[PDB]
Design a protein around this ligand. Structure first.
Ligand SMILES: CCCCCNS(=O)(=O)c1cc(S(N)(=O)=O)ccc1C(=O)O
Ligand SMILES: [Zn+2]
Length: 257
């Protein structure tokens, strides 16, 4: 099945998922000099005070921190978006070393990791319906650089030993995702896709300009996870990022001058 290795990696995905070569694929390189300030864009509205985290899952490609999305509790609104998008999960993409790991790049710069907070449009009623629509998802992307520790990340880092291998999960309640945000909510935005199979073209991407800083020790613990299941040959979960895809007929808009 699909993954990130030599034999089943991003360059192979098109054989099972032909949309891999589509017109609005993600991630992309963000050319900062070409991205145009759009004064009609709004400030993002990130309302996470009532977020209910439930569980953390190693799914064989990343780990997902899952939320209760049965009611409007944690929502993303404003910015480029019409209507209300409900938080369902967040996960990361990261590298084997600090010089790579992000999916989006900024003037070809790769960050050490990238956080994705995935939200679905509540006019479609459920997540499975939303991913079938061009405006079904809004993903908030946040770059990670290595420097000072992120205190709000450590609860995630410390549970990782209990979900080492694919299919393991652990209870993960009362985690506050506001602890993973940078100071500024300045962002770039463009229409795109899921960055993993099935690569559906259902995502409004909102990528924050300001990275968060995490410690070397924090990201090293991400790199001790396993793609494999329990007892199988150990394959470290590293370099679970899709490289930048052709921008094609798309404009990246900036929220800031
Ligand atoms: C039902 C088919 C849709 C699968 C997409 N699920 S997701 O939760 O939106 C998601 C988004 C992304 S991403 N990088 O935001 O496109 C990565 C993984 C997953 C996942 O399945 O865990
Ligand atoms: Zn992702």
């Amino acid at each position: 099945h699909w993954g990130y290795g030599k034999h089943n990696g991003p360059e192979h995905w098109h054989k099972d998922f032909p949309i891999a070569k589509g017109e609005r694929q993600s991630p992309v390189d963000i050319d900062t000099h070409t991205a145009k300030y759009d004064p009609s864009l709004k400030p993002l509205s990130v309302s996470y005070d009532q977020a209910t985290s439930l569980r953390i899952l190693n799914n064989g490609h990343a780990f997902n921190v899952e939320f209760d999305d049965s009611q409007d509790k944690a929502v993303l609104k404003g910015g480029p978006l019409d209507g209300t998008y409900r938080l369902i999960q967040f996960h990361f993409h990261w590298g084997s070393l600090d010089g790579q790991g992000s999916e989006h790049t900024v003037d070809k710069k790769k960050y050490a990791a990238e956080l994705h907070l995935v939200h679905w449009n509540t006019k479609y009623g459920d997540f499975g319906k939303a991913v079938q629509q061009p405006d079904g998802l809004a993903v908030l992307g946040i770059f990670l650089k290595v420097g000072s520790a992120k205190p709000g990340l450590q609860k995630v880092v410390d549970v990782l030993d209990s979900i080492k291998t694919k299919g393991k999960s652990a209870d993960f309640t009362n985690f506050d995702p506001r602890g993973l945000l940078p100071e500024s909510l300045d962002y770039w935005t463009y229409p795109g896709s899921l960055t993993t199979p099935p690569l559906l073209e259902c995502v409004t991407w909102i990528v924050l300009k300001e990275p968060i800083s995490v410690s070397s020790e924090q990201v090293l613990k991400f790199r001790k996870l396993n793609f494999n299941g329990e007892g199988e040959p150990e394959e470290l979960m590293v370099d679970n990022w899709r490289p930048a895809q052709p921008l094609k007929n798309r404009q990246i808009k900036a929220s800031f001058k």
